[PDB]
Each structure stands twice: as structure tokens, then as C-alpha cells.
Amino acid sequence: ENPLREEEWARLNETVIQVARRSLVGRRILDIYGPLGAGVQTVPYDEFQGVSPGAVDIVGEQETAMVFTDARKFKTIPIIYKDFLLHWRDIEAARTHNMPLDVSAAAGAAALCAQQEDELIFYGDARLGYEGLMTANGRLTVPLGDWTSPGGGFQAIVEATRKLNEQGHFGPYAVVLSPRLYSQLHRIYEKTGVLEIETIRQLASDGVYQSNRLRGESGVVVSTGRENMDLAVSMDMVAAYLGASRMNHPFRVLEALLLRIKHPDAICTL
């Protein structure tokens, strides 16, 4: 029983999608495990330090240990949601008298929803208990300090890169910083006419990124492939109708999301 006809429905969906796409940073550095459908609500989790140095042997074969999940176990996919409200007289008006049909409330809801999602990815839930990129285990901490020198925004990144490489884990890197220092990273006068951020960018090869969801003085570097960091969606950000009540109209925008870090070797923090 949809109150709204097709065009208005489409405008609402377009608005929520647009605000989400603009305001999301996490889903630009991670890759998604395909849309599983709404029904499934569990996924398998990980494999890591199954260290199997490897085998040589001439026309034959030794008996090394096959690589497999460290310990098979599952996790459950949370749900994150926001709810906005409409009025029946406004809908009647937009139907006849004055015809924009304001959709501001949907945009507010979508902004809140996307902020919650990105906070989830960059910071796990304390109450329920998940893994946060800032709070995972085995994060390979590197001292992100001693900045505010003309050079110094490069030393920390290169140290983090050697730390990833030492663990034999490399590839096209990616970097995300808190807004204060990302802005402050325009200490451009390194030696010649090139931006310190730009030389960092050619080192990382997948783009330094801005994400306000960080705290004051933090940032990460990762390895943008699969098999290291993954993101599992059950259903994307859609708008749902909760049913009439008091002749008003309530509404709700839904997300069913969970990341799973297969390989917690691709991390750096402060």
C-alpha cells in the first residue's frame, strides 16, 4: 500500500542514493562481496597466519601443510537504519496545489545512515563487539608523530610501507587521514615544485583520502585488493514504508552491512 506514485517514489530514491554516494568514503577503498539477498544473515569470517613456507622437491612432492581457515567460525550481519516522517496534508497539496514535494527529511536520514555506516567500518561497536580498522588486532603500529617539519609527512608513510613489505604484504596501497592533518598536509614546499600530498599520492597509487569520521590525530594505510579486506552487503540503502498510522506516513531507510577483515596484516595506525 504505497501512498506515493511512481515519480515521487523515484525522486525519493534518487535523493537518498545521491547523498549516500557523495558522503561515503569507506566503500571507495574496499571491495564488496556480492549482494547476497535479504534472507541470509550470516557469513564465514577469516584465514590468517597459516604460515606454510612452501615446497620445492624434484619430480615428486613433500608433505607440507595445506593452507586453510585458522578456525572456522561465523558472524552475524547487523542492520543499520534511520526513520523519517511525512504528513498527509502535504502529500495532498503536492498532489494538487503546489508541486515540489519537499524531500529534506529523507536527505537528513540518509546523511545520518551513511555516517553511521562509515563510523562502523572505521570503528567497531564497543557494546556489541566487532573489529575496527583503528582497533583491530595486529595492526602494525607506526609512530605517526614528529610532524610540523617541512618534511615528515613522507617519513611516516614510507616507514609504514616498509612495515607492510616486511610482512611480505604489498601492492597498490591506499591511505586515509583525519581532516585536520590531511588539510595540514599542504606543507608543499618539500624541495621543488610539487605537492607533498601529490608525491604521497604517487607513492600510494590508490589515492590519499579524506574521512571526517576519524579522530583528531589518526590515519591508516591498507592494501586495496580482496583477500585482505572485504565488505559484505545483504541489501543496499533503500527506502521502506512502515505502514500508515494516525493518517500520517512514517518511513525508514535501511542498510544491511558488515565488513570482514580476512587478513589482519594490512594495517597501520598511530
Binding site: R21, L24, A38, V233
Partner: peptide, 11 residues
């Protein structure tokens, strides 16, 4: 099943 809507936001 249901198609992706928001998108992938490449890699």
C-alpha cells in the same frame, strides 16, 4: 537477487 543500488565506488 536484488540488484545493487548505491554502487561499488570502484575498489
Amino acid at each position: 537477487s536484488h540488484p545493487l543500488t548505491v554502487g561499488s565506488l570502484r575498489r
